[PDB]
Coordinates of C-alpha atoms and ligand atoms in Angstrom, one line a residue:
Chain E
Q1 CA 244.7 201.8 63.1
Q2 CA 243.8 203.8 60.0
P3 CA 245.5 206.3 57.6
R4 CA 245.5 209.9 58.8
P5 CA 243.0 211.1 56.2
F6 CA 240.5 208.5 57.6
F7 CA 240.2 210.6 60.8
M8 CA 239.6 213.8 58.8
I9 CA 236.9 212.1 56.7
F10 CA 235.4 210.6 59.8
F11 CA 235.0 214.0 61.5
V12 CA 233.8 215.9 58.4
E13 CA 231.1 213.3 57.8
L14 CA 230.1 213.4 61.5
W15 CA 229.6 217.2 61.5
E16 CA 227.7 217.3 58.1
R17 CA 225.3 214.6 59.3
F18 CA 224.8 216.4 62.6
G19 CA 223.6 219.5 60.6
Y20 CA 221.3 217.4 58.5
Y21 CA 219.7 215.4 61.3
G22 CA 219.4 218.6 63.3
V23 CA 217.0 219.6 60.7
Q24 CA 215.3 216.2 60.1
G25 CA 214.5 215.6 63.7
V26 CA 212.6 218.9 64.2
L27 CA 211.2 219.5 60.8
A28 CA 207.7 217.9 61.0
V29 CA 207.1 219.6 64.4
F30 CA 208.3 222.9 62.8
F31 CA 205.8 222.6 60.0
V32 CA 202.9 221.9 62.5
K33 CA 203.8 224.4 65.2
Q34 CA 205.7 227.1 63.5
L35 CA 204.0 227.2 60.1
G36 CA 200.6 225.9 61.2
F37 CA 200.3 223.0 58.8
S38 CA 198.0 220.2 59.7
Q39 CA 199.7 216.9 60.4
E40 CA 198.6 215.7 56.9
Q41 CA 200.2 218.7 55.1
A42 CA 203.4 218.4 57.3
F43 CA 203.8 214.7 56.6
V44 CA 203.4 215.0 52.8
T45 CA 205.7 218.1 52.7
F46 CA 208.3 216.2 54.7
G47 CA 208.0 213.3 52.2
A48 CA 208.6 215.7 49.3
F49 CA 211.7 217.2 51.1
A50 CA 213.2 213.8 51.8
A51 CA 212.4 212.6 48.3
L52 CA 214.5 215.5 46.9
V53 CA 217.3 215.0 49.5
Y54 CA 217.7 211.4 48.5
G55 CA 217.0 211.5 44.8
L56 CA 219.6 214.3 44.2
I57 CA 222.5 212.2 45.7
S58 CA 223.3 210.9 42.2
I59 CA 224.3 214.4 40.9
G60 CA 227.1 214.7 43.4
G61 CA 229.0 211.6 42.4
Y62 CA 229.0 212.7 38.7
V63 CA 230.1 216.3 39.7
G64 CA 232.8 215.0 41.9
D65 CA 234.1 212.3 39.5
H66 CA 233.9 214.2 36.2
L67 CA 233.4 218.0 36.5
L68 CA 235.1 219.5 39.5
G69 CA 236.9 216.8 41.5
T70 CA 236.0 215.1 44.7
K71 CA 237.7 217.4 47.1
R72 CA 236.4 220.6 45.4
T73 CA 233.0 219.2 45.4
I74 CA 233.2 218.4 49.1
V75 CA 234.0 222.1 49.6
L76 CA 231.2 223.3 47.4
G77 CA 228.6 220.9 48.9
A78 CA 229.6 222.0 52.4
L79 CA 229.2 225.7 51.5
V80 CA 225.8 225.3 49.9
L81 CA 224.6 223.2 52.9
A82 CA 225.8 225.8 55.4
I83 CA 224.0 228.5 53.4
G84 CA 220.9 226.4 53.4
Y85 CA 221.0 226.0 57.2
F86 CA 221.5 229.7 57.8
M87 CA 218.7 230.4 55.3
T88 CA 216.4 228.1 57.3
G89 CA 217.3 230.0 60.4
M90 CA 216.5 233.3 58.6
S91 CA 213.1 231.8 57.5
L92 CA 211.9 232.6 61.1
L93 CA 212.3 236.3 60.2
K94 CA 211.2 235.8 56.6
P95 CA 208.7 232.9 56.5
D96 CA 208.4 233.0 52.7
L97 CA 212.0 231.8 52.5
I98 CA 211.4 228.3 54.0
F99 CA 210.9 226.3 50.8
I100 CA 213.9 228.0 49.1
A101 CA 215.9 227.2 52.2
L102 CA 214.9 223.5 52.1
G103 CA 215.7 223.4 48.4
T104 CA 219.2 224.7 49.2
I105 CA 219.7 221.9 51.8
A106 CA 218.5 219.3 49.3
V107 CA 220.7 220.5 46.4
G108 CA 223.5 221.0 48.9
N109 CA 223.1 217.4 50.1
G110 CA 222.9 216.2 46.5
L111 CA 226.3 217.7 45.8
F112 CA 228.0 216.6 49.0
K113 CA 226.8 213.1 50.0
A114 CA 228.6 210.7 47.7
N115 CA 232.0 212.4 47.8
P116 CA 233.4 211.7 51.3
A117 CA 233.0 207.9 50.9
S118 CA 234.6 208.1 47.5
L119 CA 237.4 210.1 49.0
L120 CA 237.7 207.5 51.8
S121 CA 238.1 204.6 49.4
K122 CA 241.1 206.3 47.9
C123 CA 243.0 206.5 51.2
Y124 CA 243.8 202.8 51.1
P125 CA 245.9 200.7 48.6
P126 CA 243.4 198.9 46.4
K127 CA 242.9 195.5 48.2
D128 CA 243.9 196.7 51.7
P129 CA 242.0 194.5 54.2
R130 CA 241.3 197.5 56.5
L131 CA 238.7 198.8 54.0
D132 CA 235.7 196.9 55.5
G133 CA 236.5 198.1 59.0
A134 CA 237.1 201.7 57.8
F135 CA 233.7 201.7 56.1
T136 CA 232.0 200.3 59.2
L137 CA 233.6 203.1 61.2
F138 CA 232.3 205.6 58.5
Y139 CA 228.7 204.3 59.0
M140 CA 229.3 204.8 62.7
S141 CA 230.5 208.3 62.1
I142 CA 227.2 209.1 60.3
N143 CA 225.2 207.7 63.1
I144 CA 227.2 209.4 65.9
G145 CA 226.4 212.7 64.2
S146 CA 222.8 211.6 63.8
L147 CA 222.5 210.5 67.4
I148 CA 223.8 213.7 68.8
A149 CA 221.6 215.9 66.6
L150 CA 218.4 213.8 67.0
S151 CA 218.9 213.8 70.8
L152 CA 219.8 217.5 71.3
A153 CA 218.2 219.5 68.5
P154 CA 214.6 219.1 69.9
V155 CA 215.8 220.2 73.4
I156 CA 217.5 223.1 71.8
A157 CA 214.6 224.1 69.7
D158 CA 212.3 224.0 72.8
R159 CA 214.6 226.0 75.1
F160 CA 216.0 228.5 72.6
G161 CA 213.9 228.4 69.5
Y162 CA 214.3 227.3 65.9
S163 CA 216.6 230.1 64.6
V164 CA 219.2 229.0 67.1
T165 CA 218.7 225.3 66.2
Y166 CA 219.2 225.9 62.5
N167 CA 222.1 228.3 63.0
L168 CA 223.8 225.6 65.0
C169 CA 223.2 223.2 62.1
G170 CA 224.9 225.9 60.0
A171 CA 227.7 226.1 62.5
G172 CA 228.2 222.3 62.4
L173 CA 228.8 222.6 58.6
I174 CA 231.1 225.5 59.1
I175 CA 233.3 223.5 61.5
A176 CA 233.2 220.5 59.1
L177 CA 234.6 222.9 56.5
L178 CA 237.2 224.2 58.9
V179 CA 238.3 220.6 59.8
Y180 CA 238.6 219.8 56.1
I181 CA 240.7 223.0 55.3
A182 CA 242.9 222.5 58.3
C183 CA 243.6 218.9 57.2
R184 CA 243.9 219.5 53.5
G185 CA 247.6 218.6 53.6
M186 CA 246.6 215.0 54.2
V187 CA 244.7 214.4 50.9
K188 CA 247.0 216.2 48.4
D189 CA 247.6 213.0 46.4
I190 CA 244.0 211.6 46.9
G191 CA 241.2 212.6 44.6
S192 CA 239.4 212.0 41.4
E193 CA 241.1 213.0 38.1
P194 CA 239.7 216.6 37.9
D195 CA 241.1 217.2 41.4
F196 CA 244.6 217.4 39.9
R197 CA 244.1 219.5 36.8
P198 CA 243.3 223.2 37.3
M199 CA 239.7 224.0 38.0
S200 CA 237.5 224.6 34.9
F201 CA 235.5 227.8 35.4
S202 CA 233.1 226.8 32.6
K203 CA 232.1 223.7 34.5
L204 CA 232.0 225.4 37.8
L205 CA 229.6 228.0 36.4
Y206 CA 227.5 225.2 34.8
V207 CA 227.3 223.5 38.2
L208 CA 226.3 226.8 40.0
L209 CA 223.6 227.5 37.4
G210 CA 222.2 224.0 37.6
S211 CA 222.3 224.2 41.4
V212 CA 220.3 227.4 41.5
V213 CA 217.8 226.2 39.0
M214 CA 217.3 223.0 41.1
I215 CA 217.0 225.0 44.3
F216 CA 214.0 226.8 42.7
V217 CA 212.6 223.5 41.2
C218 CA 212.8 221.8 44.7
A219 CA 211.1 224.8 46.3
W220 CA 208.3 224.6 43.8
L221 CA 207.9 220.8 44.1
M222 CA 207.8 220.9 47.9
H223 CA 205.2 223.6 47.8
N224 CA 203.0 221.6 45.4
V225 CA 203.4 218.0 46.4
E226 CA 200.6 216.8 44.0
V227 CA 202.6 217.8 40.8
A228 CA 205.6 216.2 42.5
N229 CA 203.6 213.0 42.9
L230 CA 202.7 213.0 39.2
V231 CA 206.2 213.9 38.1
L232 CA 207.6 210.9 40.0
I233 CA 204.8 208.7 38.7
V234 CA 205.4 209.5 35.1
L235 CA 209.2 209.4 35.6
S236 CA 208.9 206.0 37.3
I237 CA 206.5 204.5 34.7
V238 CA 208.7 205.8 32.0
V239 CA 212.1 204.8 33.4
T240 CA 210.5 201.4 34.1
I241 CA 209.5 201.1 30.5
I242 CA 213.0 201.9 29.3
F243 CA 214.4 199.4 31.8
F244 CA 212.0 196.7 30.6
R245 CA 213.0 197.3 27.0
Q246 CA 216.8 197.3 27.6
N247 CA 218.9 188.1 34.2
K248 CA 221.3 189.7 36.8
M249 CA 219.4 192.9 35.8
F250 CA 216.0 191.5 36.7
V251 CA 217.4 190.5 40.1
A252 CA 218.4 194.1 40.6
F253 CA 214.8 195.2 39.8
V254 CA 213.2 192.9 42.4
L255 CA 215.8 194.0 44.9
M256 CA 215.0 197.6 44.1
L257 CA 211.2 197.1 44.7
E258 CA 212.1 195.5 48.1
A259 CA 214.4 198.5 48.9
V260 CA 211.4 200.7 48.0
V261 CA 209.2 199.0 50.6
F262 CA 212.0 199.4 53.2
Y263 CA 212.3 203.1 52.5
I264 CA 208.6 203.6 52.8
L265 CA 208.9 202.2 56.3
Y266 CA 212.1 204.2 57.2
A267 CA 210.2 207.3 56.1
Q268 CA 207.9 206.8 59.1
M269 CA 210.5 207.6 61.8
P270 CA 210.3 211.5 61.4
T271 CA 206.6 211.5 60.8
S272 CA 204.0 208.9 62.1
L273 CA 206.3 207.2 64.6
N274 CA 207.4 210.6 65.9
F275 CA 203.9 211.8 66.6
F276 CA 203.0 208.4 67.9
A277 CA 205.7 209.0 70.6
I278 CA 204.4 212.5 71.1
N279 CA 200.8 211.5 71.6
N280 CA 200.6 208.0 73.0
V281 CA 203.9 207.2 74.8
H282 CA 205.0 208.1 78.3
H283 CA 207.6 210.9 78.1
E284 CA 209.7 209.4 80.9
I285 CA 212.3 206.6 80.8
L286 CA 214.5 205.3 83.6
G287 CA 213.2 208.2 85.8
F288 CA 214.2 210.9 83.3
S289 CA 211.9 213.3 81.5
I290 CA 212.7 213.6 77.8
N291 CA 211.5 215.5 74.8
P292 CA 209.5 212.8 72.8
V293 CA 210.9 214.2 69.5
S294 CA 214.2 213.0 70.8
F295 CA 213.0 209.4 70.6
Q296 CA 214.0 209.5 66.9
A297 CA 217.6 209.2 68.3
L298 CA 216.9 205.6 69.1
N299 CA 217.6 204.6 65.4
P300 CA 221.2 205.8 65.3
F301 CA 221.7 204.6 68.9
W302 CA 220.9 201.0 67.9
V303 CA 223.0 201.4 64.8
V304 CA 226.0 202.6 66.7
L305 CA 225.8 199.7 69.1
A306 CA 224.9 197.0 66.5
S307 CA 227.2 197.9 63.6
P308 CA 230.4 196.6 65.3
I309 CA 228.6 193.4 66.4
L310 CA 227.0 192.7 63.1
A311 CA 230.2 193.6 61.2
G312 CA 231.9 190.9 63.3
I313 CA 229.2 188.2 62.6
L314 CA 221.9 183.1 52.1
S315 CA 224.2 186.0 51.1
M316 CA 222.4 189.0 49.6
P317 CA 218.9 187.7 49.0
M318 CA 218.7 186.3 52.5
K319 CA 220.2 189.4 54.1
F320 CA 217.5 191.4 52.4
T321 CA 214.8 188.9 53.5
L322 CA 216.1 189.1 57.1
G323 CA 216.0 192.9 57.1
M324 CA 212.5 192.9 55.8
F325 CA 211.3 190.5 58.6
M326 CA 212.9 192.8 61.2
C327 CA 211.1 195.9 59.8
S328 CA 207.9 193.9 59.8
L329 CA 208.4 193.0 63.5
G330 CA 209.1 196.7 64.4
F331 CA 205.7 197.8 63.1
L332 CA 203.9 194.7 64.5
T333 CA 205.5 195.6 67.9
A334 CA 204.2 199.1 67.8
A335 CA 200.7 197.8 66.9
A336 CA 200.8 195.2 69.8
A337 CA 201.9 197.9 72.3
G338 CA 198.9 199.9 71.3
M339 CA 196.4 197.1 71.1
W340 CA 197.2 195.3 74.4
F341 CA 199.7 197.2 76.6
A342 CA 198.4 200.7 77.0
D343 CA 197.3 202.4 80.2
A344 CA 193.7 203.3 80.9
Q345 CA 194.7 206.9 79.9
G346 CA 195.9 205.6 76.4
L347 CA 199.6 205.8 77.0
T348 CA 202.2 203.1 76.4
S349 CA 205.6 202.3 77.9
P350 CA 208.6 203.9 76.2
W351 CA 210.3 200.4 76.3
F352 CA 208.0 199.4 73.5
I353 CA 209.3 202.2 71.3
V354 CA 212.9 201.2 72.3
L355 CA 212.1 197.8 70.9
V356 CA 210.4 199.1 67.7
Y357 CA 213.5 201.1 66.9
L358 CA 215.8 198.2 67.6
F359 CA 213.9 196.1 65.0
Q360 CA 213.9 199.0 62.6
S361 CA 217.7 199.6 63.0
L362 CA 218.5 195.9 62.5
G363 CA 216.4 196.0 59.3
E364 CA 218.5 199.0 58.3
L365 CA 221.8 197.2 59.0
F366 CA 220.7 194.2 56.8
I367 CA 219.2 196.2 53.9
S368 CA 220.0 199.8 53.2
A369 CA 223.7 199.5 54.2
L370 CA 224.1 196.3 52.1
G371 CA 222.0 197.4 49.1
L372 CA 223.8 199.2 46.2
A373 CA 227.1 197.5 47.1
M374 CA 225.8 194.2 45.7
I375 CA 223.7 196.0 43.2
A376 CA 227.2 197.2 42.2
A377 CA 227.9 193.5 41.8
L378 CA 224.8 192.7 39.7
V379 CA 225.7 195.3 37.1
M380 CA 225.5 201.3 35.4
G381 CA 224.7 205.0 35.3
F382 CA 221.1 204.5 34.2
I383 CA 220.6 201.9 37.1
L384 CA 222.2 204.3 39.6
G385 CA 219.8 207.0 38.4
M386 CA 216.8 204.7 38.6
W387 CA 217.9 203.6 42.1
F388 CA 217.8 207.1 43.4
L389 CA 214.6 207.8 41.5
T390 CA 212.8 204.9 43.2
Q391 CA 214.3 205.9 46.6
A392 CA 212.7 209.3 46.1
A393 CA 209.4 207.8 45.1
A394 CA 209.6 205.7 48.3
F395 CA 209.9 208.8 50.4
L396 CA 206.9 210.4 48.6
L397 CA 204.9 207.2 49.2
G398 CA 206.1 207.2 52.8
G399 CA 204.7 210.7 53.4
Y400 CA 201.4 209.6 51.9
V401 CA 201.4 206.5 54.1
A402 CA 202.1 208.7 57.2
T403 CA 199.0 210.8 56.5
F404 CA 196.8 207.9 57.6
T405 CA 197.9 208.5 61.2
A406 CA 197.4 212.3 61.0
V407 CA 195.6 213.7 64.0
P408 CA 193.4 216.9 63.8
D409 CA 194.7 219.7 65.9
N410 CA 191.6 219.8 68.2
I411 CA 191.9 216.1 69.4
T412 CA 193.3 216.0 73.0
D413 CA 192.4 212.4 74.1
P414 CA 195.0 209.7 73.7
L415 CA 192.3 207.0 73.6
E416 CA 191.1 208.6 70.4
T417 CA 194.5 208.6 68.6
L418 CA 195.7 205.2 69.9
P419 CA 193.4 203.1 67.6
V420 CA 194.4 205.1 64.5
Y421 CA 198.1 204.4 65.1
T422 CA 197.5 200.8 65.9
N423 CA 195.4 200.2 62.8
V424 CA 197.9 201.8 60.5
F425 CA 201.0 200.2 62.1
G426 CA 199.4 196.8 62.3
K427 CA 198.5 196.9 58.6
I428 CA 202.0 198.1 57.7
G429 CA 203.4 195.2 59.8
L430 CA 201.2 192.6 58.1
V431 CA 201.9 193.9 54.5
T432 CA 205.6 193.9 55.3
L433 CA 205.5 190.3 56.7
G434 CA 203.7 189.2 53.5
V435 CA 206.4 190.9 51.4
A436 CA 209.2 189.3 53.5
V437 CA 207.6 185.9 52.9
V438 CA 207.4 186.3 49.1
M439 CA 211.1 187.4 49.3
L440 CA 212.0 184.3 51.2
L441 CA 210.2 182.2 48.6
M442 CA 212.3 183.8 45.8
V443 CA 215.7 183.6 47.5
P444 CA 216.8 180.3 45.8
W445 CA 215.8 181.6 42.2
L446 CA 217.7 184.9 43.0
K447 CA 220.8 183.1 44.2
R448 CA 220.9 180.9 41.2
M449 CA 220.5 183.9 38.9
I450 CA 223.4 185.7 40.8
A451 CA 225.5 182.6 40.1
Chain H
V1 CA 210.1 222.8 83.3
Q2 CA 209.2 224.8 86.3
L3 CA 205.7 226.2 86.2
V4 CA 204.6 229.0 88.5
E5 CA 200.9 229.2 89.4
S6 CA 199.4 232.4 90.6
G7 CA 195.9 233.7 91.2
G8 CA 194.4 231.5 93.9
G9 CA 192.5 232.6 97.0
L10 CA 189.2 232.8 98.8
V11 CA 185.9 233.7 97.2
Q12 CA 182.2 233.3 97.9
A13 CA 179.8 230.9 96.2
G14 CA 178.9 232.2 92.7
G15 CA 182.0 234.3 92.4
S16 CA 185.0 234.1 90.0
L17 CA 188.8 233.5 90.2
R18 CA 191.5 233.3 87.5
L19 CA 194.5 231.0 87.9
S20 CA 197.6 231.5 85.7
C21 CA 200.5 229.3 84.8
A22 CA 203.8 230.4 83.5
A23 CA 207.0 228.5 82.7
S24 CA 210.7 229.4 82.9
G25 CA 213.2 228.4 80.3
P26 CA 211.1 226.1 78.1
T27 CA 208.5 227.9 76.0
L28 CA 205.0 226.8 77.2
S29 CA 203.9 227.0 73.6
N30 CA 205.0 223.5 72.8
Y31 CA 203.0 222.1 75.8
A32 CA 199.5 221.0 76.6
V33 CA 198.8 222.5 80.0
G34 CA 196.3 220.6 82.2
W35 CA 194.8 221.9 85.4
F36 CA 194.4 219.3 88.2
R37 CA 192.9 219.8 91.6
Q38 CA 193.1 217.9 94.9
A39 CA 190.3 218.4 97.4
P40 CA 190.8 217.3 101.1
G41 CA 190.9 213.5 101.3
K42 CA 190.8 212.8 97.5
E43 CA 193.2 212.2 94.6
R44 CA 194.4 214.8 92.0
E45 CA 191.8 214.9 89.2
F46 CA 192.0 216.5 85.8
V47 CA 189.9 219.7 85.7
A48 CA 190.6 221.4 82.4
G49 CA 193.3 221.8 79.7
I50 CA 194.5 223.3 76.5
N51 CA 196.9 221.4 74.1
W52 CA 199.6 223.0 72.0
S53 CA 197.2 224.0 69.2
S54 CA 194.1 225.3 71.0
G55 CA 192.3 221.9 71.5
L56 CA 190.4 222.0 74.9
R57 CA 189.4 219.3 77.3
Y58 CA 187.1 219.6 80.4
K59 CA 185.8 217.6 83.3
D60 CA 182.1 217.3 83.1
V61 CA 181.3 219.1 86.3
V62 CA 183.1 222.3 85.3
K63 CA 181.7 222.7 81.7
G64 CA 179.9 226.0 81.2
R65 CA 181.7 227.4 84.3
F66 CA 185.5 227.1 83.7
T67 CA 187.4 228.3 80.6
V68 CA 191.0 227.5 79.8
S69 CA 192.8 229.8 77.4
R70 CA 196.3 230.6 76.3
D71 CA 198.1 233.9 75.7
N72 CA 201.0 232.7 73.5
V73 CA 202.7 236.2 73.6
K74 CA 202.9 236.4 77.4
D75 CA 203.5 232.6 77.3
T76 CA 200.8 232.1 79.9
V77 CA 198.0 229.7 80.3
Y78 CA 194.9 230.8 82.2
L79 CA 192.0 229.1 84.0
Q80 CA 189.0 231.4 84.5
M81 CA 186.5 229.9 87.0
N82 CA 183.1 231.4 87.2
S83 CA 180.0 230.4 89.2
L84 CA 182.3 228.8 91.8
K85 CA 180.7 226.4 94.2
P86 CA 181.9 225.2 97.6
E87 CA 182.9 221.7 96.2
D88 CA 185.4 223.5 93.9
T89 CA 187.6 224.0 97.0
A90 CA 191.0 222.4 96.4
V91 CA 194.6 222.8 95.7
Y92 CA 194.9 223.5 92.0
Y93 CA 198.0 222.4 90.0
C94 CA 199.1 223.2 86.5
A95 CA 200.9 220.4 84.7
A96 CA 202.7 220.4 81.3
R97 CA 203.0 217.7 78.7
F98 CA 204.8 218.1 75.3
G99 CA 202.4 218.1 72.4
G100 CA 198.7 217.8 71.6
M101 CA 197.4 215.2 74.1
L102 CA 195.7 216.0 77.5
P103 CA 195.7 212.7 79.4
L104 CA 193.4 212.4 82.4
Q105 CA 195.9 211.1 85.0
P106 CA 198.8 212.9 86.7
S107 CA 201.3 210.4 85.3
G108 CA 200.8 211.7 81.8
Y109 CA 202.6 215.0 82.8
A110 CA 206.2 215.5 83.8
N111 CA 206.3 219.2 84.8
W112 CA 204.2 220.5 87.7
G113 CA 203.6 223.7 89.5
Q114 CA 203.6 223.8 93.3
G115 CA 199.8 224.3 93.6
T116 CA 197.5 227.1 94.7
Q117 CA 194.8 226.9 97.3
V118 CA 191.3 227.8 96.1
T119 CA 188.6 228.1 98.7
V120 CA 184.9 228.7 97.9
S121 CA 182.7 229.7 100.9
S122 CA 179.0 229.2 101.1
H123 CA 179.0 232.8 102.4
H124 CA 176.1 234.9 101.1
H125 CA 174.9 238.3 102.4
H126 CA 172.3 238.5 105.1
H127 CA 168.7 239.1 103.9
Ligands
LMT501 C1 215.2 208.6 74.1 C2 216.5 209.3 73.8 C3 216.6 210.5 74.8 C4 217.8 211.4 74.3 C5 218.4 212.0 75.6 C6 218.1 213.6 75.6 C7 219.4 214.3 75.8 C8 219.4 215.1 77.2 C9 219.0 216.5 77.0 C10 220.3 217.5 77.3 C11 220.5 217.7 78.7 C12 219.2 217.6 79.6 O1 218.4 218.7 79.3 C13 217.1 218.6 79.6 O2 216.9 217.5 80.6 C14 215.5 217.4 81.0 C15 215.4 216.4 82.1 O3 216.5 215.5 81.9 C16 214.5 217.1 79.9 O4 213.1 217.6 80.1 C17 212.6 218.9 79.9 O5 212.8 219.4 78.5 C18 212.0 218.8 77.4 C19 212.2 219.5 76.1 O6 213.3 220.4 76.1 C20 210.6 218.6 77.7 O7 209.9 217.8 76.8 C21 210.5 218.0 79.1 O8 209.1 217.6 79.4 C22 211.1 218.9 80.1 O9 210.8 218.3 81.4 C23 215.1 217.4 78.5 O10 215.6 216.1 77.9 C24 216.2 218.4 78.4 O11 215.6 219.6 78.0
D12_502 C1 239.4 228.2 44.3 C2 238.9 229.3 43.3 C3 237.4 229.6 43.6 C4 236.9 230.6 42.6 C5 235.4 230.9 42.9 C6 234.7 231.5 41.6 C7 233.3 231.8 41.8 C8 232.6 232.3 40.6 C9 231.3 233.0 41.0 C10 230.3 233.2 39.8 C11 228.9 233.7 40.2 C12 227.8 233.1 39.4
D10_503 C1 218.1 235.8 51.3 C2 216.8 236.1 50.5 C3 215.7 236.5 51.5 C4 214.4 236.4 50.7 C5 213.2 236.4 51.7 C6 211.9 236.5 51.0 C7 210.8 236.7 52.0 C8 209.9 237.8 51.6 C9 208.8 238.0 52.6 C10 207.8 239.1 52.1
OCT504 C1 238.6 224.0 46.9 C2 238.1 225.1 46.1 C3 236.6 224.9 45.7 C4 236.1 226.2 45.1 C5 234.5 226.0 45.0 C6 233.9 227.3 45.5 C7 232.9 227.9 44.5 C8 232.2 229.0 45.2
HEX505 C1 204.7 201.4 43.2 C2 203.4 201.5 43.9 C3 202.8 202.9 43.7 C4 201.5 203.0 44.4 C5 200.9 204.4 44.1 C6 199.4 204.4 44.7

């Protein structure tokens, strides 16, 4: 159906996302069990990590477009990522390495993430109709990798240990790099402008220097989440002031605040919803025993099933409003499952978590996938920067919100943890329903301003 | 995923026994291990357990007599039972659940040992 480089990009993206989600799925449990963090420390540390992973994505588009070229930056990102995974594996011998290792994944992801999609859009003549379907298949690539990693990495880490899990993340990046090198012949005339001049060693060295400095800055911020909190607070207040000094822009600002709320909620899947599954859900579905950490795989699962359907089925403000209502219902469903449908022992049916993740995945399909592509219609570089900044702030806020469900290590009774989860998830659901309603109320004004 | 219990047997009232539970491929260290017991004519009931981070839970009638503990190097969980009484007689099972929770009922646990018979005799020496 598609050009030959499409299949290359599809499989490279699949394997890189497999490595990343291999780490994401096990990381909070690794903090608690392997490093002995309390749940509170593990949740805010995960929030800082994810804030860096997501905020740094802006660097890689610039580096790919203007310094080194898209294809060279794919190679460099994949190598830094692989090194970061093998470093995380080595942190089990050398525990003092963990934060440097996570910084290396973050910087690596920052260099890599934007560039495969950019490459993909250059595989098609400019207004080729196959573009939409190819980008839907690209999203599905990401979620197939995510589904495999979130399903299997917890099982692997339990049977064989963490060093093996992280080294297989490493190995996934290595085979992504092998697939890319084997298929390089396919993209020889595809690239950004620096891809076709000789490589500038001055700029390559500047990129390496900046990368290493950022690896160390990330490590520091993740080890001291309070200064990271204040850094993002002053950066947000300040970038907000410089945005409020300099109509279709105000629309992008309200849509950004709504994206912020969405990502606060998305941040709960590896933290508070993960430990909710661990503590208060039956670990058996359809007669099979599973690792409860694997329940995270229900998000890519429902995306893979639902992204065809929803691709084959107002406009932007209403699509955002709908996504927000779906997220609200996901959390209200978790709360209702805990308030009314639990066993005498304090455990709930896994079908309720299946439904929670369905709602959350639908919200994802309506919001995060459809976000910056019609913020790219409302608009540039400053706004893209601020977009990733507020996304990072959302992950930091999400880690802080997760701490309200944190369980002390000595609690062993599910009837003690169930009400903590149900109070926090119920209040999240109600706040998010309120926000969805105010969004609905503002949809006509927003549509008129877009016009 | 398969637990092996050892240590059961026959003892007189006021004596002691020590059960042990070991797992095979999965590392028991990620698991809360609960000890259940089934006496003749009754249901499996929760006796004692340790979660994955040293939290402990006990049935009221064994407090101050039984101690659960964990050797994370040998990957073993132990149940030390002192001041045993005849009504402690039962088949004892270890059960494993991923995480920090020790639910009271058998359905909260997916992995099960085969069970060891513990018999406590009112036997005392002749005066
Ligand atoms: C909700 C999404 C579930 C994702 C599906 C998981 C993928 C299947 C795992 C790979 C093949 C099966 O491998 C194994 O199967 C048994 C029973 O099936 C499961 O069960 C066993 O291992 C896990 C952790 O490793 C323990 O929490 C579990 O209590 C234990 O009984 C595990 O899931 C998996 O270790
Ligand atoms: C394709 C050519 C790749 C050349 C790699 C140069 C690496 C320079 C290392 C400088 C170390 C700081
Ligand atoms: C690859 C660099 C490894 C650095 C490990 C630092 C850990 C020191 C522990 C005392
Ligand atoms: C395709 C060649 C990219 C070179 C970047 C590697 C720098 C270590
Ligand atoms: C944008 C809301 C920030 C809240 C920090 C307490």
